[PDB]
Amino acid sequence: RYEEIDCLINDDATIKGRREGSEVYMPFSWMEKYFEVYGKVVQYDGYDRFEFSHSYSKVYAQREQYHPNGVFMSFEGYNVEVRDRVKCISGVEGVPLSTQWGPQGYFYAIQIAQYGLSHYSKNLTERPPHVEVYDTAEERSAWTVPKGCSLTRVYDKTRATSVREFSAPENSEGVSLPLGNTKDFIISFDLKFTSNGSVSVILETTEKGPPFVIHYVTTTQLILLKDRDITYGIGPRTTWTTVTRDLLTDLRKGIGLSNTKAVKATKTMPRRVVKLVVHGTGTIDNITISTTSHMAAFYAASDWLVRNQDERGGWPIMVTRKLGEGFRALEPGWYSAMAQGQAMSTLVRAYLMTKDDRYLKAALRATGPFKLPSEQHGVKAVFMNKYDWYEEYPTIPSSFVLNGFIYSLIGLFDLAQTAGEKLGRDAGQLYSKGMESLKVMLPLYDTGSGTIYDLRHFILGTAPNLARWDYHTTHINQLQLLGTIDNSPIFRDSVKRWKSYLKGGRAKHN
Amino acid sequence: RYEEIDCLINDDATIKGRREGSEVYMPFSWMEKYFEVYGKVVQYDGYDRFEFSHSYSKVYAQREQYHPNGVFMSFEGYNVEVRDRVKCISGVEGVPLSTQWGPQGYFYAIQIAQYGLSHYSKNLTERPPHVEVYDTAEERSAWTVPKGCSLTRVYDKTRATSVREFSAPENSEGVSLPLGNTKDFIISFDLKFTSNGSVSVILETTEKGPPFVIHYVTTTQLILLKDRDITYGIGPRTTWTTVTRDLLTDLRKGIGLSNTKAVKATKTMPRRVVKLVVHGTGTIDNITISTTSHMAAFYAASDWLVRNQDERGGWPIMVTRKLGEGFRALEPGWYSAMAQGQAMSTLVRAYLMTKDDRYLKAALRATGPFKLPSEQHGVKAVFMNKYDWYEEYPTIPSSFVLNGFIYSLIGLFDLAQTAGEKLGRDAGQLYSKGMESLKVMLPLYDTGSGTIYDLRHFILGTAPNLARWDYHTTHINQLQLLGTIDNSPIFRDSVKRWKSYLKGGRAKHN
């Protein structure tokens, strides 16, 4: 005798429930939206279970105390390049290009840094990649050489082993080397062009029909799509470099090419790296395909940061940013505490890896914007005349975004610990001060059931800007990290309570 | 084909749900506790409905702009004396006595004031009471006069009409007057004793067996219970007074008499006021029974306030109060901004009714504690060195309870508006300043889904002390009141959003 029963919701709408004796059952289709909760029917052998969740995303399981040369917080599980705000990985720079606030496309230091840190972290946690090297057998030849082209083993005196000298007119089919990899999709080759040309990779995919071809060309063009040809300019390449490309990413970013702020999603996947094809004149060597190539990405990010830091020690964001109603628009050229800090964390790791002082010097200079107020090309805000804050968005009036601030602090900590007592005193001073403000202000972000993203409600006198669940777990990840390098009860206590919110826990009411 | 399905909740516990095709139904017995929501099965002609609610308690429907001589906020629907924190209504003082923080029993100005304001408000909104007058016919006699007693119509030269002179030994049955009221339970009589004695009221109730008897005796005893005899001392009564007693309250407070902080609940109700019985010598007149007697209660509260105000203009709370972990205990003698303000609101109404300046003078003096910091026998706190606050609990460190602060402000407004430009300038100055702080600090109490009771989380660095729903609607009631006397957008905007929280509305997340 389950019977249908009408359910009046807050004296407004009516939904259809079920009743069995004294028990009333309410439909999840209503619950999902009403409570903003989550549910899935999951299959088992001969039965299904319904799996309910109060929240989404998960808190990172720390394995040890945080240290500057180790994994960066939870970034071992963070895929930066896959997101639709990354238009592509530049062929010239080898780092992500952003479209998040301009469809124009711009290099954004936060993305570039996070690209570095995530690959850095994954290098520490993953099994080693499988690696296949091609064209490495006794004389002579695996290459296909059409009429009018040439491919010769030659000796470059600046190098230890022979290389391959190629010649193929642009209108010819080019010289080609069979690859045939069906498992791994990170390609690298050492390259030196003596003319305009291209290295093309032929890629069979899950899309029925002809393969896709990705053309890496000697121009500064960013990205192009025409039918099944995707083009990336990689610059002149007239001195020896190692080119490393993630074909999975390069393929999908080409497929999803869009005039909008977001790359179109695709389910298309690569199935076989068929062969490589070269047009022009020059030399090539060490043609390899690997499961992953994390450290190369890390160094590309680290080197981009060094080259693009300005005289003030900052990485200027050259797009206008309007944080919302009540906040003055930020004109191009603004700095971000988060950008500065994430860059420090990347550069410190690069320094510790190489002892190349250009990395340390860049990091030390990055402290510059932290010393100036927001209206003076800086990043410093003051909460109610007492507490220094390093702004993710240096707005007028101040905005006090939590996650970006803590990222700035982790950057300062990396730097202070690495530069040592004399050189790292400025960073260590900025850090200790920021940490004071953090410990004091942290309760202002706690709703009793989740967290708030910024202090917009108090600064503007408006509704709280509540943090979505993935920012909530980010907040937790950040505090548990800090909890390993600072023994204050507030970090362990906040983490414990903030974790309970993920399972529908709440602060007590009176 | 409704089938049972297991429901995994946050990867922890499993409950039994129901499934019909793609719809999953979850049991309210789990929902009620998990989401802390509310539900009732309500009967209709031939069917039941399940009525779901996100919250409890309701927001008061204002009918006009707030003014000092009108109803006090939502108090027309507030029953003060019925609560179990009120031990009884004193026979001597005619106002509530509290046991909330001491089972000892003490007079608490907040309760006394609210008793006054609620009865004041109900006088404005209710239909007039039915009123029955007894012993008012031509000579001579409705009285029963046992052997050895006397009851005579006599003339007191200080009074316009004859009174009844009584004489009955304490061990006699007393002289008695039939009443017989089955509908109304507020008894009053004019009284002057010339000896020790008592006026007893015989009350048939829903409890089977003999009637209860309430004895109003010429001692200072508070309240006693022995079998079906309840005793209240009303003092000597040796000069003419009007005694007014709510028999419903007097009965239940006697029945539920307890050595604890809380009066025991009872379902016992009065059914008939049978008769009145007098022992001793003296005179009595104007014996009446009414549905309600609101203004008498109002004046009893107003007069208590005048008599019990100290030299500093305050009503000292003479019990220790420990607000919670992190707050130093308050030693007896502390003041409350809420007590001060509620008293002003009562005294201003009394003044406006009577033009008796003793009421205005008391109110003006009540401003005293607002001018001193909490550690200096005052009520003033300062939020982060910038914002004056009037504390409900003047704790160390400061506590910043919202509802009590706003009550203090409504009191200051009543006073400022009533005392006029010269006399009311101090109150008007304290009010304007408090209102500045309120408008600025209000967002700190908004969780995005409810409100917070105080700022304990920020002052102590701990979990938010979330406001239960009835304090949430109190907050709303208070802001919509303020919204009628101050046109700032923040009041109308906060009210709108805070109201939506009652129906499961939430601030947007990012």
Swiss-Prot record, chains A, B:
Keyword hit for Cell division: no
Where this protein primarily resides, as one coarse class?
Golgi
Q: How is its activity regulated?
A: Inhibited by O-sulfated heparin, which is produced by a downstream step in the heparin biosynthesis pathway.
Detail which positions bind substrate.
78, 83-85, 111, 322-325, 407, 456, 468-474, 492
Q: What is the effect of changing residue 321 to A?
A: Significantly reduces catalytic activity
Effect recorded for residue 83 to A: Moderately reduces catalytic activity
Task: Tell me the route in metabolism or biology where this protein functions.
Answer: Glycan metabolism; heparan sulfate biosynthesis; Glycan metabolism; heparin biosynthesis
Q: Where does Ca(2+) bind?
A: 136, 138, 161, 285
Looking at the UniProt record, the site noted as Critical for catalysis sits at 78, 85, 453, 471
Query: Where found?
Result: Golgi apparatus membrane
Give the knockout phenotype: Double morpholino knockdown of both glcea and glceb results in dorsalized embryos, with reduced ventral tail fin, kinked tail and an enlarged heart cavity. In severe cases there is significant shortening of the body and tail coiling. Epimerase activity is reduced. Expression of the dorsalizing factor chordin is expanded, whereas expression of bmp2b is reduced, notably in the tail. Expression of gata1 in blood islets is also reduced.
This one is known as D-glucuronyl C5-epimerase B
The species this protein was found in: Danio rerio (Zebrafish)
Source gene? Answer: glceb
